[PDB]
Design a protein around this ligand. Sequence first.
Ligand SMILES: Cc1sc2ncnc(N(C)C)c2c1C
Length: 281
Amino acid sequence: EMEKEFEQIDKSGSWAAIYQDIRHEASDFPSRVAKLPKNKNRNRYRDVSPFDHSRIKLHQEDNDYINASLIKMEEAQRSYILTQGPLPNTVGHFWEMVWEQKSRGVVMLNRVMEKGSLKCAQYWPQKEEKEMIFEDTNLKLTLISEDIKSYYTVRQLELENLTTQETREILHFHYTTWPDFGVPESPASFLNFLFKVRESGSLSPEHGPVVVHCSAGIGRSGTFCLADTCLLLMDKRKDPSSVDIKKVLLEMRKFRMGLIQTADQLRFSYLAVIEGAKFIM
Ligand SMILES: Cc1sc2ncnc(N(C)C)c2c1C
């Protein structure tokens, strides 16, 4: 049982050691499309690339590339798109991906500015009456409503395909209180946020995969889909304590490199799953 594994690693202070064994064991697949010179300005970080086998392709004949990966968790029946925070020049590609993949939710785990630098383009409207038009991808985005709470904001957005005049409602879930340095002290507000995204229907198989991002789409984004998948597997299995968080993380790392960036994020992921689990038992 992980609760005991948690105390063992914690009492021994072995988090940096566990984390290194995960780094060592992690899959390595080609990322040739990401490294093409015509795609250099489509990537926020030169060392964070989608694998070719799991990359999301845009349906535009010119350049199909976006820094985004499909994470398919077969046993949990959960899919996620993990992506980088859009760049000024990729905001249109981001919304094209949301449209083409039939996503119902976008989960954002960063602020636009952190540590005095821009982590992300402002890719949604700030006011009802000031909609955004993405000329390159022929999409219109309108803010419908905004509900600001202590730890997160939920926004209802309308995305319109200007080509076909179809419209869809997108839910934007913005976790606003992840600290600039390290991880939250308690997973309570993170778990409430998770169950809010679930209650929305955004993680359900009758929609396309949820889009999850932070700045790089690997660290906080990793913690989100690791906690969700682990908790779902505990519901599904005859023996809930058969769930090994290290094994689940390695399965997820087949689909996108570097998920969970620090030993602190790994410790936080264990805490989140343990607390969530105990919130059933
Ligand atoms: C950590 C949280 S928040 C939340 N909201 C509604 N239902 C829940 N259960 C019991 C599945 C939870 C859990 C386990």
